[PDB]
Write a protein that binds this ligand. Structure first.
Ligand SMILES: C/C=C\C/C=C\C/C=C/C/C=C/CCCC(=O)O[C@H](COC(=O)CCCCCCCCCCCCC)COP(=O)(O)O[C@H]1[C@H](O)[C@@H](O)[C@H](OP(=O)(O)O)[C@@H](O)[C@H]1O
Ligand SMILES: C[C@H](CCC(=O)NCC(=O)O)[C@H]1CC[C@H]2[C@@H]3[C@H](O)C[C@@H]4C[C@H](O)CC[C@]4(C)[C@H]3CC[C@]12C
Ligand SMILES: CC(C)CCC[C@@H](C)[C@H]1CC[C@H]2[C@@H]3CC=C4C[C@@H](O)CC[C@]4(C)[C@H]3CC[C@]12C
Ligand SMILES: [C]N([C])([C])[C][C]C1=[C][N]C2=C1[C]=C([O])[C]=[C]2
Lengths: 286, 222, 332, 53, 232
């Protein structure tokens, strides 16, 4: 009965994610009004998330529901590679979106003159290249005899060097870069907001409201990403160096892994469904 | 394989024309469209650089295209919509003209006409999200006139000092008060004068601020 | 003192002739029925909202005008861009196709309807003549012949131009308001114009005078089109109503409006038989009206912005529509 | 003066012989029925004789 | 409009010579270009084609590979590279310009050409008579036939009639079997069926004397007939 409930919940999650991502991917194409550099980055992020939902999630659901691997070493390697590649691609797509917003905010001249879809294409290509770099080692090398040693397990490579490299280049460098860029964006927004007496009081009210809104937006954008990935990556970094002691309860691992995948469902919500252009497009098409 | 050779050549020509059109559109996109309305319009145009007159001036690596809708006495309800999407609107008024009546049996005043036009443009449906670069020209003559004749003639209810600073600030505030949608659009006001780049730089700063604020709004931050 | 009695004298005479309305006669006429209009060719490539479009006499070539500064002539069957004309003025609001197909006229905010010659030995569209002289924006320019073109301008005056001379052969000044649209009769002897004064006036080309005036509309008239028989013409306004005027009756015969329509009308056209009234509405849609029974026999959709211009082919087999979304769709 | 021009224009009041609306309405339907089969939009042309199909 | 060719001369077998055409009076980029040869005391034969933008390039079977064509839009000049010239290549090449769109007139202008003195499902066009004796003021009819129906499903008959008066370049009379070319007397008329075509002169004049040629454009391996030589 427990497995039935787990299957129901996980299938509901994998579905809703697929629907949400495919909706954005179809909206970007069926309405002319949404084809923008920032919106092409958002659509590429949605495509990456849809790939996560369709390919990596079904193999992963089978792992949790049955508590065992039932597809063999080749399938396990393919699943690990695809999961790592797509998750890194989604994280770096978020980073690229952050970078594009920072450049647009702080470089209006470039936005007017030197901004074209070729920028979004290059950003997407670079994000996918970083994902390829992160996911290559577990296929072109590594996979030590102790790794995947259990015939019914599909554990990711836990080599110290590979673990630090992957964790860094997948969550921490993107985390620091996003933090710095969003801090600069916050400072710029504060400067712009700061930059008869009843009218002055009204303008002060408007400035305070804009400060609250920017704080809320930054908080959501950073906190969803952190709450989703940081629990997963902290464990992924600690456990390889904590083999001797860490008990590693299975429930906590399952909860984090899924938080991380749920990240794929939440990304399109935050970046398109809160976006006014996408919501208007959905209202018009529907 | 259902198309003849001439059909293939026509398709090639059509796609080449499409490429040329897309290139021209890309060239036109990287430009700033500003609408001039107004009163020192000629002086402002000079300092910045029968139908619509277009002036192209580049400052700090940004190309600005300003379209002058002056001399079009026809009703503006039928052609004003052609200017949707302009980054900002440059509205120019003359401070010294508060004492002028624009003839017509003194049925109107130049300041009142200017404020009416400003209100109409600002509250127009097509420009609900367009910043206004308000210009107050002829400050020297305004000071010279207020020295002798108080501006209260144009403003019956203004009881205050006749000094240049106070009168200019009151006129600027009166122009600002016309904004019924102050939240969405910013109204930049500048005492233009008629020397040096004091106007081109102000226009550039206003355009930059409008672009930055629009970009922030797109992300939802601002 | 100021011609007080004259106004009512015409009013009484016009009133006396009302014996039976058009609705009574068309009771026995069967309805058109649903028209299964569907898009067949989607002409795209304009990068800005378009305002005017005119079909060629061959019923295949059509000319499209857009504010992007580009005039595109389209091959309806193959959807090929036969020619692209870079307009010097980037504020075009009207365009026309010469009946012979040799010349194309373009006008807008600039007080000029430049004549473009398509047939040249050097194989490029070069400006032939610039019909400058209007004091306001040109609202509509239409060719009576390959050498004579009638123009409508916001300066409340319509002008007849001898293209070879480059000067106004005749000026029509009876309108007490800006003139928005112009339509030509089949014989080209007379034409009609609509104005923001909420009225339309019958203009004779050669004698250069007004024959009749119609004032049914409550607001500015946006578009007008002559009935195929040439004895009537329909007009569209901001009233959200289309009206039919008969020249020999001097009176409006019927109104084409619906309670659910509130926005203005941007385009008007007739089918070859005259039974269908193709009216472009500002609400991103075109409604087909039964010209005889004044009923909505069909509707067209698929436009993401305001409908600006539409026209039925002289062959009467298809109708093209233009919208500010920058997409031209042909319906059959 | 505009009065002379206006009266000259209105002189056209009775220069044209007129036909009652009933005859014109009948002629309209007569023309429609005469060319009823010559209008494909009124009589759907078979797909074989339809270039657009 | 004017097209001047260059590069003609005597070339020994196996040599390579480039023929250049200079454009003046029209937009070279917009117009496509063609090369039609004419061996001495012989007929016409299409050589090569290049479209605007260089996207489409085609060559005849007998010259494909050896001869390559190129265009220089900025300088308004056309080039036709030639390699391994053979005795069969001894012909005067004529540069032609065509523009392809509805209502257009392909092959509407022919240059003077450049003289060169060296040393399969194709639609064959055959003309009934090589020469016909005629007199001024009398109607003259020229008939030609095609091995394949030139009337495509679009409804256009891709037949082109060319007139080459003595010591002069070919001139286009009828370009789609029914439409008269620009700057041509209305006396010329064209009619025919899907396979049989006829050119009729309403009233023969002195200028009409020359050699009449026919061409098919349904398929790009253009073929020219032997030609009809009218004499007074
Ligand atoms: C401790 C107490 C305090 C802490 C908590 C209490 C107080 C604070 C609450 C925190 C907010 C909780 C989440 C709700 C957020 C919320 O309010 O959403 C707002 C309204 O939308 C709807 O609600 C409507 C919902 C629409 C959903 C889309 C429909 C489809 C959803 C299913 C998708 C899956 C199936 C496909 C809009 O979102 P927003 O409030 O966050 O404001 C902005 C948003 O953050 C930006 O993302 C967005 O652009 P971005 O920067 O690029 O990302 C902006 O345009 C704007 O939307
Ligand atoms: C999950 C994959 C199929 C890939 C997939 O699901 N596509 C992506 C998606 O749509 O999710 C499964 C389906 C059937 C599986 C195979 C079959 O179960 C048969 C066989 C069973 C052995 O235990 C392992 C090897 C082997 C040969 C399995 C390897 C993994 C396969 C190929
Ligand atoms: C942000 C939103 C979408 C998150 C929703 C909560 C997610 C994280 C929940 C919903 C259902 C949950 C799963 C349900 C079943 C089990 C069983 C146990 O043996 C390990 C945890 C595991 C595998 C859970 C992991 C977390 C999970 C996937
Ligand atoms: C979904 N999930 C599973 C959660 C994802 C994860 C990831 C990504 N990338 C990486 C990872 C991990 C490690 O360890 C490394 C690297």
């Amino acid at each position: 009965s427990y497995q039935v409930i787990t299957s129901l919940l996980l299938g509901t999650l994998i579905f809703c994610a697929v629907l949400g991502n495919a909706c954005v991917v179809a909206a970007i194409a069926l309405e002319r009004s949404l084809q923008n550099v920032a919106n092409y980055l958002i659509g590429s992020l949605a495509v990456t998330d849809l790939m996560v939902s369709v390919l990596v999630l079904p193999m992963a659901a089978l792992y949790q529901v049955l508590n065992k691997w039932t597809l063999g070493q080749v399938t396990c390697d393919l699943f690990i590679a695809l999961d790592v590649l797509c998750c890194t691609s989604s994280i770096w797509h978020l980073c690229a979106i952050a970078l594009d917003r920072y450049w647009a905010i702080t470089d209006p001249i470039d936005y007017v003159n030197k901004r074209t879809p070729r920028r979004a294409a290059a950003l997407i290509s670079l994000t996918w290249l970083i994902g390829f770099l992160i996911s290559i080692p577990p296929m072109l090398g590594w996979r030590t005899p102790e790794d995947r040693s259990d015939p019914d397990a599909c554990t990711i490579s836990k080599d110290h060097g590979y673990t630090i490299y992957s964790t860094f280049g997948a969550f921490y460098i993107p985390l620091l870069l996003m933090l710095v860029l969003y801090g600069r964006i916050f400072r710029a927004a504060r400067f712009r907001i700061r930059k008869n007496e009843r009218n002055a009081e009204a303008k002060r009210k408007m400035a305070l409201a804009r400060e609250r809104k920017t704080v809320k937006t930054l908080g959501i954008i950073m906190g969803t990403f952190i709450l989703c990935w940081l629990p997963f990556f902290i464990v992924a970094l600690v456990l390889p160096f904590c083999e001797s002691s860490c008990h590693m309860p299975t429930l906590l691992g399952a909860i984090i892994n899924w938080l991380g995948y749920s990240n794929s469902l939440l990304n399109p919500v935050i970046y398109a469904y809160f976006n006014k252009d996408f919501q208007n497009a959905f209202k018009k098409i529907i | 394989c259902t198309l003849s050779a001439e059909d293939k050549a026509a398709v090639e020509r059509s796609k080449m024309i499409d490429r040329n059109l897309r290139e021209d559109g890309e060239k036109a996109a990287r430009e700033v469209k500003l609408l001039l309305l107004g009163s020192g319009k000629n002086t402002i145009v000079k300092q910045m650089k029968t139908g619509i007159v277009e002036t192209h001036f580049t400052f700090k690596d940004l190309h600005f295209k300003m379209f002058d809708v002056g001399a079009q006495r026809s009703e503006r309800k039928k052609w004003i919509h052609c200017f949707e999407g302009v980054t900002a609107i440059i509205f120019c008024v003359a401070l010294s003209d508060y004492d002028l009546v624009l003839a017509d049996e003194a049925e109107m005043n130049r300041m009142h006409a200017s404020m009416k036009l400003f209100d109409s443009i600002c509250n127009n449906k097509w420009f609900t999200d367009t910043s206004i670069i308000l210009f107050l020209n002829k400050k020297d003559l305004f000071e010279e006139k207020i020295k002798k004749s108080p501006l209260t003639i144009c403003y019956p209810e203004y009881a205050g000092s006749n000094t240049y600073e106070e009168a200019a600030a009151y006129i600027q505030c009166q122009f600002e008060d016309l904004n019924k949608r102050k939240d969405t659009k910013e109204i930049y006001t500048h005492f233009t004068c008629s020397t040096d780049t004091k106007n081109v730089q102000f226009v550039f700063d206003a355009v930059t601020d409008v672009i930055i604020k629009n970009n922030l709004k797109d992300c939802g931050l601002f | 003192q100021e011609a007080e009695q004259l106004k009512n004298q015409i009013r009484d005479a016009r009133k006396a002739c009302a014996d039976a309305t058009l609705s009574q006669i068309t009771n026995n006429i069967d309805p058109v029925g649903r028209i299964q209009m569907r898009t067949r060719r989607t002409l795209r490539g304009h990068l800005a909202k378009i305002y005017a479009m005119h079909w060629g006499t061959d019923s295949r070539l059509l000319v499209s005008a857009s504010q992007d500064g580009k005039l595109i002539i389209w091959d309806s069957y193959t959807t090929n861009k036969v020619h692209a004309i870079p307009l010097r003025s980037s504020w075009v609001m009207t365009c026309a196709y010469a009946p012979s197909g040799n010349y194309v006229a373009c006008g807008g905010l600039d007080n000029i309807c430049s004549i473009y010659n398509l047939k040249t030995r050097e194989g490029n569209v070069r400006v032939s003549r610039e019909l400058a002289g209007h004091t306001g924006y040109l609202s509509c320019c239409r060719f009576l012949d390959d050498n004579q073109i009638v123009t409508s301008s916001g300066d409340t005056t319509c002008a007849l131009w001898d293209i070879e001379t480059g000067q106004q052969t005749t000026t029509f000044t009876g309108h007490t308001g800006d003139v928005m649209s112009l339509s030509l009769a089949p014989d080209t002897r007379l034409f009609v114009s609509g104005a923001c004064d909420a009225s339309a006036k019958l203009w004779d080309v050669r004698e250069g005078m007004c024959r009749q005036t119609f004032t049914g509309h409550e607001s500015d008239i946006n578009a007008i089109c002559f009935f195929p028989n040439g004895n009537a013409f329909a007009t569209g306004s901001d009233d959200a109503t289309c009206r039919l005027f008969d020249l020999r009756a001097d009176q409006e015969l019927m109104t084409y409006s619906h309670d659910n329509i509130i926005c203005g009308i941007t385009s008007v056209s007739f089918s070859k038989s005259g039974r269908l009234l193709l009216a472009g509405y500002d609400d991103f849609n075109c409604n087909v009206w039964d010209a005889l029974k004044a009923d909505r026999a069909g509707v067209l959709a698929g436009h993401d912005n305001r409908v600006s211009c539409l026209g039925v082919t002289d062959d009467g087999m298809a109708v093209a529509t233009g919208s500010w979304d920058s997409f031209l769709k042909i319906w059959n | 003066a505009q009065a002379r021009k206006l009266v000259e224009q209105l002189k056209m009041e009775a220069n044209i012989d007129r036909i009652k609306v009933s005859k014109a309405a009948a002629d309209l339907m007569a023309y429609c029925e005469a060319h009823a089969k010559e209008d494909p939009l009124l009589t759907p042309v078979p797909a074989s004789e339809n270039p657009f199909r | 409009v004017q097209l001047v060719e260059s590069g003609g001369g005597l070339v020994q077998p196996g040599g390579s010579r480039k023929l250049s055409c200079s454009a003046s009076g029209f937009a070279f980029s917009s117009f496509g270009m063609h090369w039609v040869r004419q061996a001495p005391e012989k007929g016409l034969e299409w050589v090569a084609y290049i479209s605007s933008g260089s996207g489409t390039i085609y060559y005849a079977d007998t010259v494909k590979g050896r001869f390559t064509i190129s265009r220089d839009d900025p300088k308004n000049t056309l080039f036709l590279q030639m390699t391994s010239l053979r005795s069969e290549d001894t012909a005067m090449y004529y540069c032609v310009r065509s523009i392809y769109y509805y209502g257009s007139s392909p092959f509407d202008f022919w240059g003077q050409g450049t003289t060169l003195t060296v040393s399969s499902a194709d639609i064959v066009m055959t003309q009934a008579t090589s020469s016909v004796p005629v007199t001024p003021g009398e109607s003259v009819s020229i008939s030609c036939r095609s091995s394949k129906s030139l009337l495509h499903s679009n409804g256009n008959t891709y037949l082109y009639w060319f007139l080459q008066r003595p010591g002069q370049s070919p001139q286009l009379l009828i370009y789609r079997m029914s439409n008269l070319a620009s700057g041509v007397p209305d006396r010329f008329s064209g009619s025919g069926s899907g396979t049989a075509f006829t050119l009729t002169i309403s009233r023969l004049e002195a200028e009409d004397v020359g050699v009449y040629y026919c061409m098919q454009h349904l398929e790009y391996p253009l073929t020219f007939g032997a030609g009809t030589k009218l004499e007074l």
